[PDB]
Amino acid sequence: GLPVLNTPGSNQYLTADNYQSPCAIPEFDVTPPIDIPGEVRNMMELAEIDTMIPLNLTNQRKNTMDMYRVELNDAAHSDTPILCLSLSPASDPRLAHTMLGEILNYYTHWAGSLKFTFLFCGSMMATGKLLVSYAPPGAEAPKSRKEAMLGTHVIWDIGLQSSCTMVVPWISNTTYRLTINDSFTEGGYISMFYQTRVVVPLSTPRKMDILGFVSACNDFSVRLLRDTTHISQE
Amino acid sequence: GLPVLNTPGSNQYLTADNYQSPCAIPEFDVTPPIDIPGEVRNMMELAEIDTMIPLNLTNQ
Amino acid sequence: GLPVLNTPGSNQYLTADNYQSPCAIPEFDVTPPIDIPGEVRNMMELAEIDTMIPLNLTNQ
Amino acid sequence: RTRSESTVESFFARGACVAIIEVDNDAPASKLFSIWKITYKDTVQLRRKLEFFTYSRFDMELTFVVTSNYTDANNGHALNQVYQIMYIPPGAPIPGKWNDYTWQTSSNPSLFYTYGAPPARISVPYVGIANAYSHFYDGFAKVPLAGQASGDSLYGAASLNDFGSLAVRVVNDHNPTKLTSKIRVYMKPKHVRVWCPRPPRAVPYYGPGVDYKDGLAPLPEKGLTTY
Amino acid sequence: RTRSESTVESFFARGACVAIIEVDNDAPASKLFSIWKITYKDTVQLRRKLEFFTYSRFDMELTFVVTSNYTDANNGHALNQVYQIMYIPPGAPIPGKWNDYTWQTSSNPSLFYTYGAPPARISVPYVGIANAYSHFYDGFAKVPLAGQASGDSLYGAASLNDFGSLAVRVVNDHNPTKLTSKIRVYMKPKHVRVWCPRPPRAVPYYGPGVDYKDGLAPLPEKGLTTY
Amino acid sequence: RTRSESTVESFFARGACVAIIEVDNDAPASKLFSIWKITYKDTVQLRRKLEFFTYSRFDMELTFVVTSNYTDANNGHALNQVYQIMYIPPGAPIPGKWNDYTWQTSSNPSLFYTYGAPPARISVPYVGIANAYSHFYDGFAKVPLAGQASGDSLYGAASLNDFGSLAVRVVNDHNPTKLTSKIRVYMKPKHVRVWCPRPPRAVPYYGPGVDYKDGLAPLPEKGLTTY
Amino acid sequence: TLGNSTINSVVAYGRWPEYIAVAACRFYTLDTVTWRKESRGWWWKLPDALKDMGLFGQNMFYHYLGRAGYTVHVQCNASKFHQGALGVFAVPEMCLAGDSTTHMFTKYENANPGEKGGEFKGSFTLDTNATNPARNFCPVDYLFGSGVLAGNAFVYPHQIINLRTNNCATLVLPYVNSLSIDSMTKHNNWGIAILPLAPLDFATESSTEIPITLTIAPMCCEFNGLRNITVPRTQ
Ligand SMILES: CCCCCCCCCCCCC/C=C/[C@H](O)[C@H](N)CO
Ligand SMILES: CCCCCCCCCCCCC/C=C/[C@H](O)[C@H](N)CO
Ligand SMILES: CCCCCCCCCCCCC/C=C/[C@H](O)[C@H](N)CO
């Protein structure tokens, strides 16, 4: 026949190959598709959906609903942080199991901006101002409002609006970060502080809850599909 | 010769495959068909014929 | 299929060959290059650089 | 909803097993070569599918799947075997020994298969002496004539379905150890045309004809007023 | 930065192991043939990836990786084995013995694999009786009716995911020595469309449904004011 | 006289051995699977050639040459082995046992090689997270901060050269006899671009960095006024 | 306004209900539930919750095939001195985990409770009665009753009722299925889950309770296959 020469790689099975194969059921009359609502073309479309952050992963709160609630009170003003988060969306245990983190744990590289929304769930009679800050990596993690104020930040007036969004823009030395805990590709710090205190009148609850949601922005992307550590078989 | 790479599925026999093979009787002069009555193109044509139903399937 | 004949040299691995192979990470979005200073196209460009000669190779 | 998979072509576009020919590689109780008369009536599934119709034309694709085994444990090793499959059309001399001259196959088509290779495959065109194959023949090859003693041919038997045989042997000289091989023959009709549909077989086949002997009560019991 | 590798196509463009079918080549405690019901729910990784969505359409590519071994040392040698993998769609007769007539596979698709050859591979189109596959079905196959005794079908079980089985045997006649073989089945969806994203599985799977029994505390401990 | 063979492409257009991964096929002192972290610094020749430059971009071609042998004489025979090579990118779960679920490789690229086949081969594009690979990195992954106890990262170590690992096992169930296999990995850069030439290594390599310990007197003795 | 019934909104997947009876498909009010401080959540199935609603239930049980979208209106009012948040989620194919070591052992009468629906639990309890198993759902709130984290339930069509901001939620669910039309008695196309995201609180009262009311209107209804009446077995 035609002279041919078998190159190396012949007879191998690469599970990522893209080859044709014979059809085992020829002339099958396939059922046509219908217009079902909710079609998805890209997994990033799922990462762009806000999902609640299990922020309060304490011994008594983890694996309950209480792990989603962060408690504020009406005590006197202080510079102590309300919450502290590492910008490691796939390896920080508080972000790993959100929809964004679940998508990220199927990939090796990620890049793009993030969106953090905070929802205040107190009474309508409550007032207060909060400071939400992102510090890029390199320095010690901010432990007071004085240090946090030096980074990117927004001021949230709960009386004016019950939900506030801070976009963390993409700022990295590398073009992508790794989806594991790695010092060279560290992301930075997210912190929350009291700008003023929370004030309530009489006959009002003095403790209330906030909730956190995270999603990816439209510039987000991932690379190098890989197996996840969030599912195992015994 | 021409560089080639054997993909998976090489050397398998799939009974539903559609491949060419060498002719074991070359240059055979085939008898031409005649116009026989009752040609069938589709098995559904047989399913469109009424046939009696064995409705009374009792012991006797 | 297509009649083929395996010529000698089939199934060998020549480390100097130039053949295609399947991609193990399809659809990877490659980082674009930047304009780094000091690009080299030919090793002779390095041989055209003056370097000091160790002329006095005595015991001491 | 189209009827693409119920066309006659699609209905028969499958390789069906029609024979298991057994041969042995042993020094001359053994069978060093086997003759199989070519027919689809040794099995049932393809026969029942074909007998939906009275007449047919088609090309045939034959595929040969070869398996082999040692007969005794740790009796020794063997070198890879080569098998010869020779088509003997009706009238050609039939081998009588493993080594007889007929295997020279100067005019008979022959196929040499190396064990471990992918199943062998050949194609043949429509080879019927009539304008179509007859699945059913309501007649005799000879009409007995007055004056003849007690033209006694069998009912339905005619040379319009005589296609020769396959002679199968192992080409290798016999090993010190005994080896057994089986060649499975798979038929696939192609470019099929069929005529005169018939009701399908309802009881077990009995011989190459339409005779029946057993299993004559196929249908089960079911109450008339029971869904 | 494009999103080429996060498209639904790229997300599923991998061959995932879904089954390890075990067969034996031995004289008739052994299993001379095995039946595997076709599903992706015997494993977890592909199942979790698919259950990100409620509905899907796709063609399927099946790849078969076959390995085999002797059971005893210096017990003897064996000739190269041939394996038959027959697709039995729902309703087709199911083999009950290694040698029963069903293996003639006149209408069932079948695959014959020679050991040492590259893994076998076939493709099938979207074969669902509905307009899409259902990863989740919130209903019953039967509604129990008043008057019926104690329509008791299982929750979520429906014939919309019934695709038949694979029957696997060794075609060779049995060696004097015992051989064991495993066929690993790898699935790759192709031309994928998906609908209605769902949150991913967070606790270990328990059965073909959504039931959970163990490992219900997945998340670890992490201080609120600790980075 | 052209300089076609001294182009950067031609200088690196060779498959260089970078690893010998050893695995065993034995019943569970043996190693039923091996993990190799992907690097070119286990060998010297390709490393020295690459370290003529500071930065590089290229695609990589990997070729796998597999050899195997029995460990004991006349201990028995074995059926042809199949090997699995699974790429584990950084972050993916790492196999801990020969049979653990990770080998299902639903999302990890995997390669199944049949012994006796031509060496396996795959290609990958430029996969660096930076705009080029760094052969030398004059810095730390962590800067230690005042207040921290005795940010202690190693000098020059950065995740910009972390590419995952290869996990290698024998897929076959374990033979009665012990078998040993070695997989040699050969790298060939393709479509190469390089920047910032450096003087070549003059003394033996010592570790993944630029440290030196021995053989610090490379040059021989030669009289000044002697040709 | 839909029919004789009259009275932000979220259209699930941005798809309004559409055709491939008319009087019967109108707003129906289910039984009110009581939101307490210790409430864990509530769930309903559609069309199961409407099976005893005027002519819509009659059309459900008189036909082999039916399809409909829905408009779900959750109503819950409180004072400016109350606090609390509800998440209202519309889940296609809302399968709930059972309570036994047997897979998919929940019986039809328990999987189709009707307009009363069911409640989420705070933890998982395994039914041990073997002679008389309960064969009921055991949906854990933080597992969202199906082995997934409730925090990610926001990938479903949803609304949030924050007591300081709004007192009502409106979800427009189109007909979602792998088929153009199905059996309404065999299959529930939609599930409604209401979870307290923030617990209810009122100043210096560990007694406050507030009602939640659901009003559901089927839309774009189609029925086919008229026969005698289906009478499902009850428990
Ligand atoms: C050289 C290797 C052998 C290859 C030659 C194979 C034999 C040639 C074909 C002879 C058989 C003709 C096809 C048979 C048709 C069916 O028997 C008819 N339907 C009978 O009614
Ligand atoms: C002839 C050798 C065997 C080749 C035939 C293989 C069987 C044919 C394919 C049947 C399986 C259909 C594909 C299965 C799809 C998934 O199970 C669905 N996602 C279920 O929801
Ligand atoms: C599925 C079988 C395995 C095939 C996948 C092989 C692994 C993928 C490639 C990872 C290694 C990237 C190439 C390495 C580049 C050099 O290390 C850089 N010059 C380091 O400076």
Author numbering:
A (entry chain C): 1 to 234
B (entry chain C), C (entry chain C): 1 to 60
D (entry chain A), E (entry chain A), F (entry chain A): 70 to 97, 101 to 222, 225 to 301
G (entry chain B): 86 to 92, 99 to 111, 126 to 340
Give the article text.
Empty capsids (ECs), which are also produced during infection, are antigenically indistinguishable from mature viral particles but do not contain viral genome and do not cleave VP022.
Detailed structural analyses and comparison of the PV2-SC6b and PV2-SC5a VLPs from bioreactor production were performed by single particle cryo-EM. Data were collected as described in “Methods”. The quality of the cryo-EM electron potential maps is sufficient to resolve the stabilising mutations and confirm that they introduce no significant perturbations to the structure and do not impinge on the antigenic surface of the particle. For PV2-SC6b the mutation in subunit VP4 I57V (I57V in VP0) and for PV2-SC5a the mutation in subunit VP1 T41I, were in disordered regions of the map and were not modelled.
